[PDB]
């Protein structure tokens, strides 16, 4: 049907912000997903401060 504007959401898992979901911002992608949204630890949100997104990190490929 008629389209207005093309936009996206956080987690690569197609899910908007939910104060029940905790995120981590793609250091290189600049976006967020639920820790598990990308298969990461839970506390990974706190014990973290150098996390990168898998969508962006993919380019870094270590």
């Amino acid at each position: 049907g008629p389209l207005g504007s093309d936009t996206k959401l956080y987690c690569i898992c197609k899910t908007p912000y939910d104060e029940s979901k905790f995120y981590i911002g793609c250091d290189r992608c600049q976006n967020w997903y639920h820790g598990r949204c990308v298969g990461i630890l839970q506390s990974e949100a706190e014990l973290i401060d150098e996390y990168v997104c898998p969508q962006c990190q993919s380019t870094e490929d270590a």
Partner: peptide, 15 residues
């Protein structure tokens, strides 16, 4: 990193 988390449960400890 740009960790995006929440802490609504916490109020604010003086220390």
């Amino acid at each position: 990193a740009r960790t995006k988390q929440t802490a609504r449960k916490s109020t604010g400890g003086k220390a």
